[PDB]
Amino acid sequence: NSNICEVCNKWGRLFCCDTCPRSFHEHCHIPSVEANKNPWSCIFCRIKTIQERCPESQSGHQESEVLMRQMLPEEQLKCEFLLLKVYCDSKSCFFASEPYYNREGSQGPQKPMWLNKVKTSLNEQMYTRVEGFVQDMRLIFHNHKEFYREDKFTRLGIQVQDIFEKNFRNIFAIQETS
Ligand SMILES: [Zn+2]
Ligand SMILES: [Zn+2]
Numbered sequence: 001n002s003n004i005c006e007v008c009n010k011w012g013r014l015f016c017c018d019t020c021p022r023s024f025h026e027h028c029h030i031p032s033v034e035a036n037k038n039p040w041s042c043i044f045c046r047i048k049t050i051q052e053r054c055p056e057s058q059s060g061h062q063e064s065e066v067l068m069r070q071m072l073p074e075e076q077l078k079c080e081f082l083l084l085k086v087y088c089d090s091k092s093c094f095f096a097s098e099p100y101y102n103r104e105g106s107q108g109p110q111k112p113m114w115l116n117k118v119k120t121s122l123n124e125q126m127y128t129r130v131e132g133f134v135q136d137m138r139l140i141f142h143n144h145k146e147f148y149r150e151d152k153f154t155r156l157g158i159q160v161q162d163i164f165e166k167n168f169r170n171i172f173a174i175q176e177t178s
């Protein structure tokens, strides 16, 4: 197995995947690495199995159909993995914890949002449809763009949103378009 966490790229107390060479800190993995379970398979492995059991699940889909899906176990897992893929980018640090807003010439957002809040919401099964999760994720970046206005720091929101959107299109097999 790898000797660094797949998500944060640091060493430490790592839990190893039994079906692939990835390793994880306990709370870097989503869901948090399960207490017992031998063997243990990570989220990358679990997502690969879904695809392997239903190869047609990779044919193209319309975003509007994906969003209205109820959060059954497989969709819950896919949103967990999408969230994890965002945390895998080091620029996610900017969006992880609860923000505050005190900048001359700007007003904070009406509905603040952050990664750890989305993480908690998934853990607590607060989303009934994929749309709930996607809306909160996109609101993280939209709030950031609006608040930072013409400061060049706005680009961090563009960057991490692009990681989110690419992975959303991959994980949920959205139909490719120009
Ligand atoms: Zn980690
Ligand atoms: Zn694995």
Ligand SMILES: [Zn+2]
Pocket (backbone or CB within 6 Å): 053, 054, 055, 056
């Ligand atoms: Zn099938």
